[PDB]
Amino acid sequence: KFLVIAGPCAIESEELLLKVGEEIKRLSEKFKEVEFVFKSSFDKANRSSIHSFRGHGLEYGVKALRKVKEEFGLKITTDIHESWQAEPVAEVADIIQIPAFLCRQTDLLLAAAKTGRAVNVKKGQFLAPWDTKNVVEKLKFGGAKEIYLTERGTTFGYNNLVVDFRSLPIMKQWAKVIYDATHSVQLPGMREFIFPLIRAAVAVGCDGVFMETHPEPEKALSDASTQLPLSQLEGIIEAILEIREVASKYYETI
Amino acid sequence: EKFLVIAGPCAIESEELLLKVGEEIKRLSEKFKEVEFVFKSSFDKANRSSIHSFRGHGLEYGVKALRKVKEEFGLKITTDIHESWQAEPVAEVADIIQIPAFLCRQTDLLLAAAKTGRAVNVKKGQFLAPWDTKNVVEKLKFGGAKEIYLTERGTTFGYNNLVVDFRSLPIMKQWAKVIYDATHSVQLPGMREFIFPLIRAAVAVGCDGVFMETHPEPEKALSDASTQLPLSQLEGIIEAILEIREVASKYYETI
Amino acid sequence: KFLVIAGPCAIESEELLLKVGEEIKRLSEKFKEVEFVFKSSFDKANRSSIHSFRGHGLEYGVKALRKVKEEFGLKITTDIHESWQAEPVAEVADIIQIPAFLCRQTDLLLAAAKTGRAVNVKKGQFLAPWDTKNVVEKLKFGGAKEIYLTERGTTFGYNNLVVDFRSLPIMKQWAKVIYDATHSVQLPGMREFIFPLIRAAVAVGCDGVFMETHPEPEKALSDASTQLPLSQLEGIIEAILEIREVASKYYETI
Amino acid sequence: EKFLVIAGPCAIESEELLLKVGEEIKRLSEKFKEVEFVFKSSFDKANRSSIHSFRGHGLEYGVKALRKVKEEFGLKITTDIHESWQAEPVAEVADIIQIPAFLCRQTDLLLAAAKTGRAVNVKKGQFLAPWDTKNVVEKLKFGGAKEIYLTERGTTFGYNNLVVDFRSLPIMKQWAKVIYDATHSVQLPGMREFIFPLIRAAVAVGCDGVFMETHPEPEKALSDASTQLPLSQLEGIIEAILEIREVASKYYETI
Numbered sequence A, C: 001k002f003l004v005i006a007g008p009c010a011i012e013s014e015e016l017l018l019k020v021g022e023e024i025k026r027l028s029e030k031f032k033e034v035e036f037v038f039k040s041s042f043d044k045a046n047r048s049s050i051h052s053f054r055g056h057g058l059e060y061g062v063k064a065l066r067k068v069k070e071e072f073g074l075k076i077t078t079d080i081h082e083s084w085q086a087e088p089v090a091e092v093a094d095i096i097q098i099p100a101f102l103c104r105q106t107d108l109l110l111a112a113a114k115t116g117r118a119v120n121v122k123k124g125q126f127l128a129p130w131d132t133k134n135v136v137e138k139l140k141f142g143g144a145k146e147i148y149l150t151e152r153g154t155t156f157g158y159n160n161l162v163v164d165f166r167s168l169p170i171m172k173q174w175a176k177v178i179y180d181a182t183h184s185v186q187l188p189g190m191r192e193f194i195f196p197l198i199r200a201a202v203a204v205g206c207d208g209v210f211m212e213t214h215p216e217p218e219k220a221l222s223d224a225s226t227q228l229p230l231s232q233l234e235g236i237i238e239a240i241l242e243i244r245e246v247a248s249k250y251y252e253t254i
Numbered sequence B, D: 001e002k003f004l005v006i007a008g009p010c011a012i013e014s015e016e017l018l019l020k021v022g023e024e025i026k027r028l029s030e031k032f033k034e035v036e037f038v039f040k041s042s043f044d045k046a047n048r049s050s051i052h053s054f055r056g057h058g059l060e061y062g063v064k065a066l067r068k069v070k071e072e073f074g075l076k077i078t079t080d081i082h083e084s085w086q087a088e089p090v091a092e093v094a095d096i097i098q099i100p101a102f103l104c105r106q107t108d109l110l111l112a113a114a115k116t117g118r119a120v121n122v123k124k125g126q127f128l129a130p131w132d133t134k135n136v137v138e139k140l141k142f143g144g145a146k147e148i149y150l151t152e153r154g155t156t157f158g159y160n161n162l163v164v165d166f167r168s169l170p171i172m173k174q175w176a177k178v179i180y181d182a183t184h185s186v187q188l189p190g191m192r193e194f195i196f197p198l199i200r201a202a203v204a205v206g207c208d209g210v211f212m213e214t215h216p217e218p219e220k221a222l223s224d225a226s227t228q229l230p231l232s233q234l235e236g237i238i239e240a241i242l243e244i245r246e247v248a249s250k251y252y253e254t255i
């Protein structure tokens, strides 16, 4: 079934996670043909500034995600930044996420694959679509069986990313493809382009969408510009399901 | 508003080729009554890479051929101009005058097209940012153009490659009707396998029309033989984009 | 010998041309091993805004350039925008310049080549280095014998140009190569990068440099940001001649 | 100031290979007394595209090999780290700790390197704008680094291609010493014919040093066999850049 990965960018507090998890739980009940995965980062390990918000740590984060899965029965996903984090994170995360800048770090990918969990690799802004074939191979070699590749934009000049939708059908040759609707419009972002491009993604054909959502984006401690207002999530999901229903008839074979 | 489908063979290989494609476009126009069809073909490929490549049979022959299509099928006509003097003679048959992508900044060419009283469609240069088309529209309005179109046809992405930044559709819609060129946006300065998926994206995002080069036998074309859509596939593609447009339409943002 | 093409961007008046021509004449006398070519456009035919300065026309322009060549004995170069302009311009211009956006317009190139004059094609911001081979072929087919290709930057994301210096040795395979030092840093520009990149061009190896210079750039009616202050021209020329003298020992064969 | 030349085989194929290159670098250091040489080699290629490609013989073996080079030739040493825990063991032999291009934004790795008290050289990510290296330097200073270098190694330009925007040299010089990577800046994500011309450009523009991978027999290298410079060509290249630097130096702008 179609995958919808959503949640607040960073674990600002398990308090915030529970509220978002409550809404995502409601949607999962409303859209039974959609597999929802709750997402949130326990650490923003690659912020540009040393003075920016990173988070409350791996322990506090895993703890919070635990509360979400136990209280709502929702699958979990979060990203790791160094090999040692794979095992402890795998205790809760159903899908281990590999950051875009780290999509070529062999040991990180192998550590994720060794946990037995599913692995979702964010395609680096420097990577060509066809070069993700080797990324998948590393994971398979490492024992991974459920593998995802996430489109999140490509470097286009300075401080700008472009989404080359040709990447969707290309990557589909070796893995399930997820479209990251929030970071793809981010400027190394205009919220005005989030919905339009999500529509494009489902019209082209993908296996799921990734969206950062927050009750009050403006008050968010991270991505206050691109995080989707929680209340708008239902409408966007219904919209992409309707577009997918009609467009899927034309999705090219493999 | 009626969706625009601009289609036809890339080059006017012969008046016969035109009538063959015109016949099919006329048939589709009868079926897809919610679509406004415009027959397109270039009387001259004035910017081919090689001096040895096919250019055409001249303006006189081309305009005469286009006039036959219009007379025989009652179809609207569009073709591109390359120098200012061509605007007047072309305006006699063309309902929409097309401005080539490399020439989207040539003031006199734009002015020449605008004073004819015909609609003008400017292909966005591969070097132009979406927001910089605002001045292109300003020039046309200044020159008398009342019906203006901007066509997305890809942007330079490294060497010999174009990428389609779909954010350009809503940006350009702020000042003109927007057309998506489904065949030139995938050509390597020609991966036909991406034509259909990208056109689906264009209509899902939202545009006012699509531009497609089509030929009875692409493999035998004298230009863009790798990107022209086989004529027999046109009907299916149009049906598909009309279906996607309809279901996505309620979500199109207001400019 | 090394080529130095310089002059004010636009023919603001033959008055301005004479002053610049006077300085360029002085430099040509000082640097005998350098072939100076006086440059100025009679029309800015591709301005972004319809309300921008274009010039005084082809007639007034050719007239002014005439005064420069007659009063200083300097070679002349200016750009054409439509085929009919080649003949009248060829009456004065020793080298006919083809604008970057028009480097693929077959008839414009043929019209220039038919005049018997030398032709300098500005490499389009959309063109790959190796694709200039066909540009040269068109000109040769048209009767041109003295052909130049000018590097002026390549599209890099939006509103930015990057200079890929690998283009110099690549283009040298089929034509003499000129480096445009003023437009290459322009943003579809920071004057701070003009000199540094000119140094790079001569260290890599080229057949000449193109520089827009004006007595009072700030008061210029065009490119008031990138036009080099007339008084700084001598210093830059001496600098590139010294760098060339030493670096030329290492220029790769053809 | 003394020009920095960082050179050595891309990967520590064997301690023997290291000593062979070390011998030549030591010889050149005796000739080019105005240059500060730093011997470089990676104990691990932690980001190869294929799982089947050569990675190395482990940190322990690599550090031991590098230590032999330092002991035998008295050469400064630099190698790259991939995870925070490697900073400490590496700092025991490395005078300069290198941060890989893809990892230039990984805060903990940068902090781990900075607290060792060693110099730190960060390869500018192919995704990073020149002005965004200012925060990279800030992180290192925050972490205790007193000697910081930024290395230009190209920027993503379309797919499988890198371009060197030389404007980055003067921009980055505003906050750190700048090094130009002559071998990785031309590799297609490997046109050896552009290595020399681009290094000439770097020194003419002005930088504080150059980085060059060199191997006795590049064709037999286990990594970057297409971009590593034959060791016999190193002397000539260094002489050439010293000559160009000298003549261009009086024109270097003040930051």
Ligand SMILES: O=P(O)(O)CN(CC(O)O)C[C@@H](O)[C@@H](O)[C@H](O)[C@H](O)COP(=O)(O)O
Pocket: A009, A041, A044, A046, A047, A048, A049, A052, A079, A098, A099, A100, A101, A122, A152, A183, A188, A212
């Ligand atoms: O690795 P990616 O950038 O795709 C992933 N994501 C996580 C996710 O998928 O939610 C991490 C991003 O939040 C992170 O890279 C940010 O974009 C980065 O911190 C940029 O922030 P800034 O420091 O303010 O410039």
Ligand SMILES: O=P(O)(O)CN(CC(O)O)C[C@@H](O)[C@@H](O)[C@H](O)[C@H](O)COP(=O)(O)O
Pocket: B010, B042, B045, B047, B048, B049, B050, B053, B080, B099, B100, B101, B102, B123, B153, B184, B189, B213, B224
């Ligand atoms: O100006 P554009 O390139 O968008 C327009 N079109 C016309 C159209 O819209 O059908 C002209 C193209 O046919 C033309 O530029 C070709 O793509 C170009 O000649 C490519 O052919 P080639 O010489 O083989 O490199």
Ligand SMILES: O=P(O)(O)CN(CC(O)O)C[C@@H](O)[C@@H](O)[C@H](O)[C@H](O)COP(=O)(O)O
Pocket: C009, C041, C044, C046, C047, C048, C049, C052, C079, C098, C099, C100, C101, C122, C152, C183, C188, C212
């Ligand atoms: O064709 P090119 O752009 O290289 C040439 N040059 C002439 C020259 O070589 O001096 C023309 C330029 O002056 C012209 O294209 C300008 O860069 C263009 O007018 C940009 O100006 P603007 O309208 O202010 O955005």
Ligand SMILES: O=P(O)(O)CN(CC(O)O)C[C@@H](O)[C@@H](O)[C@H](O)[C@H](O)COP(=O)(O)O
Pocket: D010, D042, D045, D047, D048, D049, D050, D053, D080, D099, D100, D101, D102, D123, D153, D184, D189, D213, D224
């Ligand atoms: O981090 P960077 O890529 O600049 C650094 N360097 C180290 C150095 O400076 O010698 C690592 C490179 O060797 C490494 O990224 C290679 O270029 C990369 O593994 C290319 O090899 P391949 O697996 O065949 O695609």
